[PDB]
Amino acid sequence: AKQESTEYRRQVQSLTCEVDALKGTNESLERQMREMEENFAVEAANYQDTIG
Amino acid sequence: VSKPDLTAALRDVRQQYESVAAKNLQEAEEWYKSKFADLSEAANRNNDALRQ
């Protein structure tokens, strides 16, 4: 039960590193939705030269 | 002097003045269009600076 307790603690600590590395990549998807708003700033720039 | 004739040449000087006055308004109209391109493409550049 202590070899087993050392196993499931390591697997849960590895899963804890997942759940906080996923969130720092969810905070990266919140930047890819700004690379969207910059690709729409290129739509608005080609629409500025359109309108002008 | 049996008919004044010169009164035609004085109307053609007047039609030159009215033609040049109309073209001076079109020079100002193209300068206002230049400023409308400045303002419109500045508004497109602000929508692209918001993407940036």
CB contact under 8 A, B51 and A51: no
The distance in angstroms from the start CA to the end CA of chain B is: 77
Taking the C-alpha atoms of residue A36 and residue A27, their distance in angstroms, rounded to an integer, is: 15
Q: Which two tokens stand for residue B36?
A: 């409308």
- Which of B33, B48, B32, B28 is closest to A52 using CA atoms? B33
**In this structure, how many other beta carbons lie within 10 angstroms of the beta carbon of residue B49?**
13
Distance from CA of A29 to the nearest CA of B (A): 16
Say which residue the tokens 């206002």 belong to: B32
Taking contacts as CB-CB distances below 8 angstroms, the residues of chain B near A45 are: 44-45, 47-48
Contact at 8 Å (CB) between B50 and A41? yes
B37 touches chain A (CB under 8 A): yes
Residues 6 or more apart whose Cβ sits within 8 Å of residue A38 = B51, B52
Q: Which amino acid is at A51?
A: I
Query: What experimental approach yielded this model?
Result: cryo-EM
The beta-carbon neighbor of B51 closest among A40, A51, A52 is A40
Taking the C-alpha atoms of residue B8 and residue B51, their distance in angstroms, rounded to an integer, is: 64
